[PDB]
Amino acid sequence: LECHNQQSSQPPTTKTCPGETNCYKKVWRDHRGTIIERGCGCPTVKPGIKLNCCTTDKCNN
């Protein structure tokens, strides 16, 4: 599938992963602030972190 992989404020870039069929989003908070990041695949979650996944393209625009 093909997905976008830019972080918080950088200009647009993308990558290709033929073998997987889904893309993912991750979000987390700490004492000083919070951050968000994008990727290929759909990994496990843990308490304190939040995660989400999609199957259509250009979902995590």
C-alpha angles and dihedrals in degrees: 000000000000123000138174117252108189121140124226102300109358119117117262126294130157137196135201126231111180103189100050123071102199140062128209145214125205129192130179139170133211134171097279101045142303133265137195130208136183132219152151121273129026113260133183127287131227132197112280096028125084123211135180133184137201137192104202121081127261090017096130092054 
